Design an enzyme around this catalytic site. Sequence first.
Site, short mmCIF file in Angstrom:
data_model
loop_
_atom_site.label_atom_id
_atom_site.label_comp_id
_atom_site.label_asym_id
_atom_site.label_seq_id
_atom_site.Cartn_x
_atom_site.Cartn_y
_atom_site.Cartn_z
N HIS A 175 0.86 -1.21 0.00
CA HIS A 175 0.00 0.00 0.00
C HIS A 175 0.88 1.24 0.00
O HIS A 175 1.35 1.66 1.06
CB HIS A 175 -0.93 -0.01 1.19
N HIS A 195 -2.67 6.96 -1.11
CA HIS A 195 -3.69 7.59 -0.25
C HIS A 195 -3.15 8.36 0.94
O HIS A 195 -3.86 8.53 1.96
CB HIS A 195 -4.77 6.59 0.22
N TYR A 243 -0.77 7.67 3.07
CA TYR A 243 -0.28 6.85 4.18
C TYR A 243 1.25 6.88 4.18
O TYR A 243 1.85 7.76 3.57
CB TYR A 243 -0.98 5.48 4.14
C1 LIG Z 1 -14.66 1.41 2.67
C2 LIG Z 1 -13.41 1.56 1.82
C3 LIG Z 1 -12.22 1.11 2.34
C4 LIG Z 1 -11.06 1.22 1.58
N1 LIG Z 1 -9.91 0.68 2.12
C5 LIG Z 1 -8.76 0.67 1.34
C6 LIG Z 1 -7.62 -0.04 1.77
O1 LIG Z 1 -7.57 -0.75 2.83
N2 LIG Z 1 -6.51 -0.01 0.94
C7 LIG Z 1 -6.49 0.70 -0.24
O2 LIG Z 1 -5.45 0.68 -0.92
N3 LIG Z 1 -7.61 1.34 -0.67
C8 LIG Z 1 -8.72 1.28 0.09
N4 LIG Z 1 -9.87 1.88 -0.41
C9 LIG Z 1 -9.84 2.42 -1.81
C10 LIG Z 1 -10.46 1.31 -2.72
O3 LIG Z 1 -9.53 0.24 -2.85
C11 LIG Z 1 -10.77 1.80 -4.14
O4 LIG Z 1 -9.55 2.24 -4.75
C12 LIG Z 1 -11.76 2.98 -4.18
O5 LIG Z 1 -12.94 2.66 -3.45
C13 LIG Z 1 -12.08 3.56 -5.59
O6 LIG Z 1 -12.65 2.47 -6.33
P1 LIG Z 1 -14.28 2.25 -6.52
O7 LIG Z 1 -14.82 3.44 -7.37
O8 LIG Z 1 -14.32 0.96 -7.30
O9 LIG Z 1 -14.89 2.19 -5.20
C14 LIG Z 1 -11.04 1.79 0.33
C15 LIG Z 1 -12.23 2.33 -0.16
C16 LIG Z 1 -13.42 2.22 0.57
C17 LIG Z 1 -14.73 2.81 0.04
#
Ligand SMILES: Cc1cc2nc3c(=O)[nH]c(=O)nc-3n(C[C@H](O)[C@H](O)[C@H](O)COP(=O)(O)O)c2cc1C
Length: 355
Positions: free
Chosen positions: A176, A179, A181
């Site tokens: 990871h 975002h 982090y």
């Molecule tokens: C509830 C939630 C938790 C997420 N947790 C992580 C995570 O643990 N690691 C990460 O790299 N991205 C995390 N994300 C980002 C998602 O992996 C994804 O990139 C994002 O939701 C955009 O894609 P989507 O339009 O398909 O939702 C999270 C997103 C959501 C909504």
Amino acid sequence: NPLFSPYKMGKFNLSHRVVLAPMTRCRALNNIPQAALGEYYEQRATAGGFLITEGTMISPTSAGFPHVPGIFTKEQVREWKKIVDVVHAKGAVIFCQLWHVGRASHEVYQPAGAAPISSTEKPISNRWRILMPDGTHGIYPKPRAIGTYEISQVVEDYRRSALNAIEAGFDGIEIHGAHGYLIDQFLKDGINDRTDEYGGSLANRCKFITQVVQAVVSAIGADRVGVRVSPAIDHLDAMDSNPLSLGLAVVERLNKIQLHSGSKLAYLHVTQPRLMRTLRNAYQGTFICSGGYTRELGIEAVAQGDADLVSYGRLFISNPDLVMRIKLNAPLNKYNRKTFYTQDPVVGYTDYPFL
Ligand SMILES: Cc1cc2nc3c(=O)[nH]c(=O)nc-3n(C[C@H](O)[C@H](O)[C@H](O)COP(=O)(O)O)c2cc1C
């Protein structure tokens, strides 16, 4: 439908290109994977499908959300093995995402209530607030800027966590680096204000991710390592002055790691808030795109050569059978944001129905 053409992700023969994006859900009570996680991943697993877990702690200081799993203890390995086994029984491939939040934490999430760690001593600004264990939102504290010995020990925590993931039976791990982090706190020039060899220049800012990737590649093999970055996402005060040059600099380092080790990473995974295609075209290997994809947008991404695999987050929360629904062009079900990060083992977690 090009999402259903097979794809070879190095040693893994995938039957389709719909990937479960990593999503923090906060059901791993006390940082221990629970039976509920087994039910959730089993529901979404498909034969020849690729799944990426929620972000998983690499050390006791790595968390900034409640009830997220770790993979740094042998008890956590034993519990993850039970989840990995149920996913493998469906024929799916699963990687564990290794996650350190750096400064995006709070004393409530740190051992002894200590300050979180980062590249910098600056706190995230009060434009952003952290989810607390009781469901309120709190204030991000000032972090402690780590020295280079401690950097090398965080790298070792990633190395040991990758070995623990292989011990639990995972097919590989994802770094990871996205975002805002810890890794992004080194990458982004909006955050990294260091004057030592991990700061200033673009090359120095890329040293930490390069060393993390090199350590996990050495420990488990490049074909079991994916890397996730988000150069254009500015979450948690993580902006870069030149997102495209930062992305291309990371890609160059990945290409060099592969040439030196004589092996390709599993993939590069980029999540967005032309840049995407430019990074894909620069990277020698498999590309996973992410952020806002739908059935039609994922079909287009693969048909137009923009990505090899497409990851879905929110739609997979509420469509356990998202792969089959995409295959059939069946209507998708809405998700409820209120239960994204609650602790209930069922409600808003495993109780979204199948077709
Ligand atoms: C509830 C939630 C938790 C997420 N947790 C992580 C995570 O643990 N690691 C990460 O790299 N991205 C995390 N994300 C980002 C998602 O992996 C994804 O990139 C994002 O939701 C955009 O894609 P989507 O339009 O398909 O939702 C999270 C997103 C959501 C909504």
